[PDB]
Design a protein around this ligand. Structure first.
Ligand SMILES: *[C@@H]1O[C@H](CO)[C@@H](O[C@@H]2O[C@H](CO)[C@@H](O)[C@H](O)[C@H]2NC(C)=O)[C@H](O)[C@H]1NC(C)=O
Ligand SMILES: *[C@@H]1O[C@H](CO)[C@@H](O[C@@H]2O[C@H](CO)[C@@H](O)[C@H](O)[C@H]2NC(C)=O)[C@H](O)[C@H]1NC(C)=O
Ligand SMILES: *[C@@H]1O[C@H](CO)[C@@H](O[C@@H]2O[C@H](CO)[C@@H](O)[C@H](O)[C@H]2NC(C)=O)[C@H](O)[C@H]1NC(C)=O
Ligand SMILES: *[C@@H]1O[C@H](CO)[C@@H](O[C@@H]2O[C@H](CO)[C@@H](O)[C@H](O)[C@H]2NC(C)=O)[C@H](O)[C@H]1NC(C)=O
Ligand SMILES: *[C@@H]1O[C@H](CO)[C@@H](O)[C@H](O)[C@H]1NC(C)=O
Ligand SMILES: *[C@@H]1O[C@H](CO)[C@@H](O)[C@H](O)[C@H]1NC(C)=O
Ligand SMILES: *[C@@H]1O[C@H](CO)[C@@H](O)[C@H](O)[C@H]1NC(C)=O
Ligand SMILES: *[C@@H]1O[C@H](CO)[C@@H](O)[C@H](O)[C@H]1NC(C)=O
Ligand SMILES: *[C@@H]1O[C@H](CO)[C@@H](O)[C@H](O)[C@H]1NC(C)=O
Ligand SMILES: *[C@@H]1O[C@H](CO)[C@@H](O)[C@H](O)[C@H]1NC(C)=O
Ligand SMILES: *[C@@H]1O[C@H](CO)[C@@H](O)[C@H](O)[C@H]1NC(C)=O
Ligand SMILES: *[C@@H]1O[C@H](CO)[C@@H](O)[C@H](O)[C@H]1NC(C)=O
Ligand SMILES: *[C@@H]1O[C@H](CO)[C@@H](O)[C@H](O)[C@H]1NC(C)=O
Lengths: 49, 116, 423, 181
């Protein structure tokens, strides 16, 4: 899978998101942020496995 | 084999049972995400561009995750084809509606009267 | 001049272009599931392109909102369509008509041959009837999509109908917050008052002016139905917007220094280590192509925004009031204007005033009455043939010279050309 | 954001083994590392060119906005403009410029009519057989008699020979209501 890890001021991992769990998580992966403001965003197209 | 205007195999003859088969890409279409803001809520509404399909069909596509509203407010989240979404108290949820162009008004036309 | 004519001209201005978006992960590195690992190593080159393209998408809606959505009240159709003999039909919508657009707007929409992006191209349509080889089905397979505009064609038509109705009924007053009711008679009289001529001409020749207005509208209709290249500036926008996407699609068959231009062939004949070089070369080439496309789209968007700003300014000036700027609204003297919708643009119909017939007159700068100069108040003295008269510069209206239409200043020595007469 | 993106674009392997130099130069000799160094140079030069192009495209729009602001200053601030909806929404009277970070703020003083009043009117008046067209304004029926007033403010005035001009007869004009001057 593909993950995004967050490092605090110290050398530790405190939170992580999965780029395939939810469309909101996919959008967060695309923008590289943990907070999303209001609006309509365009993510990757619908993919079939 | 076969090829397109862009180099890509679309037609392949079956080795066994010669019969000509078409090859097409698996992924096709478009999807957008509507969110009221992470600070407010974690719910989202997904809009698929090319589908017939709380679903609700628009001219842009089939929008899921939101509720239809028959009254018209102003536009805050500009979805295509005149539809708009907002966070309203229906607890709250995402509601879709047609944007209001303006305020209705009528003026009587007379050939002998003026307004000063 | 001794006679006048009413001329109606047309002006075509684009306001927005096609709104598009691209999915790089499908255009480049299509369904490889192994190249996608190398695409991550090349960096976040895609977010910049998508963010740059989203700004154009927002701006092309802001342009349409600024150009048309200028009136806050949505006035209704006056359901009369005949004010003082001025036939306003064929411009305002007809209730007993299927479409919500008038006859002229339908003609304008019929001229432009749009590529007809249905905005709903389902998988069933692009999976069957492949022998047609539709260009749009080929673009959507590579992640190139066209978003639909926020304002539909019906809302723009309603905006133009409301503007025309307000111009017909309210007049020039609705440019401010409020709108004052007035008949089309004295509204045209006031328009004839700010042009230079007096109010006498309209109240005396209303029939001829109305006939000329109707004939000009009919001639505009015939020109719209007959001429082949009329909305060329609007057609060019579609022609370039489709051509750019088609070029981007056909640019996928180029060997950017690799053995082959089609993947799943390099990955099938070479191992992981050897094929990575060719995959990186292809990724670099296709990314360069995408960047070039984005740059050209931005450059085009700049000009489109400038044209939209000019169209909005011309609407706010000519449509919502009488402009005294030379050759700004129409060729001649501006009287009024009517906006009409068009595919990815707006069409202005400018009603102007043009003098037609000339007449020779010998004249003098001033007249000496008893030893003091009598300079004109406004206008020029003329020799009609029997005596001296004073008249305006835009219409021959002889008037007897009296103390009201002239002002006394100085003596009859400094001014050159003083011809004696009586007041 | 452009500068931050340019900074964060320095960690991309443009077809090389690693995105950070002094690592390719430490594990490979002079001849072998030159290829990776050239690849990195090409990628970073492309990034710089893209940044410069975007900056130029933005500068074009900024220059256009600055030209519009200068024109609006020269017209509205230094004089009274008779252009509809140019300076402010309404009828322009005066303007005041104010400074702002990387911009300018205009304060437009305008004139807006507020209260309406109905009046029945006529295009002209017949006095003795000749038409008396308005000089400037429109006649109104105040309720007792006929008066002439401007289009922007109700100021009743008695009809006299000064505020009207005689032309033609009372046959061509439609709607002539008889009165006295
Ligand atoms: C990261 O470590 C620092 C330093 O220990 C923690 O912040 C506080 O730092 C002060 C001195 O500036 C110490 O007296 C505190 O004990 C520290 N707090 C704690 C809870 O240990 C900081 O909390 C650490 N961040 C983490 C663990 O996420
Ligand atoms: C390759 O072998 C397959 C084995 O199935 C052949 O398929 C059969 O072909 C016969 C006629 O030759 C048919 O009657 C059978 O119904 C087929 N079976 C299946 C499962 O399809 C195939 O024709 C052979 N191909 C060649 C080129 O000889
Ligand atoms: C000015 O020209 C107009 C036409 O542009 C004259 O009005 C009538 O025009 C029609 C159409 O050509 C003719 O059939 C009529 O005979 C014209 N009426 C006449 C000659 O009385 C108009 O008369 C001309 N003169 C003025 C002062 O308006
Ligand atoms: C305004 O113009 C319209 C369009 O030409 C006129 O409608 C036509 O009127 C004629 C004459 O009566 C009819 O023969 C046509 O059939 C009408 N056409 C349509 C499409 O309805 C209309 O009469 C004019 N209004 C006037 C002169 O007051
Ligand atoms: C797609 O949906 C519309 C309603 O939005 C429906 O009328 C139409 O039949 C559908 N089209 C197809 C091809 O199934
Ligand atoms: C006015 O006189 C000049 C000089 O003779 C002549 O050229 C011109 O045609 C005349 N104009 C008209 C309208 O008769
Ligand atoms: C001058 O005006 C008089 C007014 O009575 C008129 O009779 C005469 O014909 C005019 N002269 C011309 C038109 O040359
Ligand atoms: C006009 O010019 C002519 C020569 O072309 C001259 O004889 C005449 O005096 C001039 N008239 C005036 C009023 O200056
Ligand atoms: C006007 O009167 C003056 C003063 O008597 C005289 O000199 C002149 O010749 C007269 N005629 C003209 C055309 O100025
Ligand atoms: C003027 O009269 C019309 C028609 O009766 C009416 O609708 C309108 O409200 C009146 N306006 C005012 C300001 O009283
Ligand atoms: C008309 O004006 C007269 C002036 O004396 C005034 O008395 C009267 O009230 C007016 N009519 C109205 C306001 O209806
Ligand atoms: C105004 O229109 C009405 C019909 O609405 C008509 O009866 C009346 O005569 C018209 N008045 C004038 C002055 O034309
Ligand atoms: C005005 O006077 C004329 C001429 O006597 C007459 O025909 C008409 O009826 C009078 N009234 C109006 C309102 O025009």
């Amino acid at each position: 899978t593909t993950f995004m890890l967050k490092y605090d001021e110290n050398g530790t991992i405190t939170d992580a998101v999965d780029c395939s769990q939810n469309p909101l998580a996919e959008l967060k992966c695309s923008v590289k942020s943990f907070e999303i403001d209001k609006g309509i965003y365009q993510t990757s197209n619908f993919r079939v496995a | 084999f076969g090829r397109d205007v862009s180099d890509f195999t679309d037609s392949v003859r079956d080795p066994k049972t010669s019969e000509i088969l078409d090859i097409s890409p698996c992924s096709f279409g478009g999807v957008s995400v509507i969110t009221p803001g992470t600070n407010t809520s974690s719910e989202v509404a997904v809009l698929y561009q090319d589908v017939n399909c709380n679903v609700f069909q628009t001219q842009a596509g089939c929008l899921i995750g939101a509720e239809h509203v028959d009254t018209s407010y102003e536009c805050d989240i500009p979805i295509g084809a005149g539809i708009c979404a907002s966070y309203h108290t229906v607890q709250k949820s995402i509601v879709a509606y047609t944007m209001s162009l303006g305020a209705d008004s009528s003026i009587a036309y007379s050939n002998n009267t003026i307004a000063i | 001049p001794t006679n006048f004519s009413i001329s109606i001209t047309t002006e075509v201005m684009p306001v927005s272009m096609a709104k598009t978006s691209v999915d790089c992960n499908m255009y480049i590195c299509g369904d490889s599931t192994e190249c996608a690992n190398l695409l991550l190593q090349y960096g976040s080159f895609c977010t910049q392109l998508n963010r740059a393209l989203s700004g154009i998408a927002v701006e092309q809606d802001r342009n349409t909102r600024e150009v048309f959505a200028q009136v806050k009240q949505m006035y209704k159709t006056p359901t009369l369509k005949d004010f003082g003999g001025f036939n306003f039909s064929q411009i305002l919508p007809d209730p007993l008509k299927p479409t919500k657009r008038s006859f002229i707007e339908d003609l304008l929409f019929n001229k432009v041959t749009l590529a007809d992006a249905g905005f709903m191209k389902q998988y069933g349509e692009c999976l069957g009837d492949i022998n047609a080889r539709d260009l749009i089905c080929a673009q959507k397979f590579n992640g190139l999509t066209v978003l639909p505009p926020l304002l539909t064609d019906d809302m723009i038509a309603a905006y133009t109908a409301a503007l025309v109705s307000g111009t017909a009924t309210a007049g020039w007053t609705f440019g401010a917050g409020a709108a004052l009711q007035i008949p089309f008679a004295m509204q045209m009289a006031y328009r004839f008052n700010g042009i230079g001529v007096t109010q006498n001409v309209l109240y005396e020749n209303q029939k001829q002016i109305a006939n000329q207005f109707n004939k000009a509208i009919s001639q505009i209709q015939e020109s719209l139905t007959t001429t082949s290249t009329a909305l060329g500036k609007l057609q060019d926008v579609v022609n370039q917007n489709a051509q750019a996407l088609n070029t981007l699609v056909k640019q996928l068959s180029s060997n950017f220094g690799a053995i082959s231009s089609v993947l799943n062939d390099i990955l099938s004949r070479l191992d992981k280590v050897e094929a990575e070089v060719q995959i990186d070369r292809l990724i670099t080439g296709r990314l360069q192509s995408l960047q070039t496309y984005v740059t050209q789209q931005l450059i085009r968007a700049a000009e489109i925004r400038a044209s939209a700003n000019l169209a909005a300014t011309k609407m706010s000036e000519c449509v919502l009031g009488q402009s005294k700027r030379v050759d700004f609204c129409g060729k001649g003297y501006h009287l009024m204007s009517f906006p009409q919708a068009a595919p990815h643009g707006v069409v202005f119909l400018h009603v102007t005033y043009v003098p037609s017939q000339e007449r020779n007159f010998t004249t003098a700068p001033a007249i000496c009455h008893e030893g003091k100069a009598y300079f004109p108040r406004e206008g020029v003295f003329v020799f009609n043939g029997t005596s001296w008269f004073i008249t305006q510069r835009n219409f021959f209206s002889p008037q007897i010279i009296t103390t009201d239409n002239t002002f006394v200043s100085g003596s009859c020595d400094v001014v050159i050309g003083i011809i004696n007469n009586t007041v």
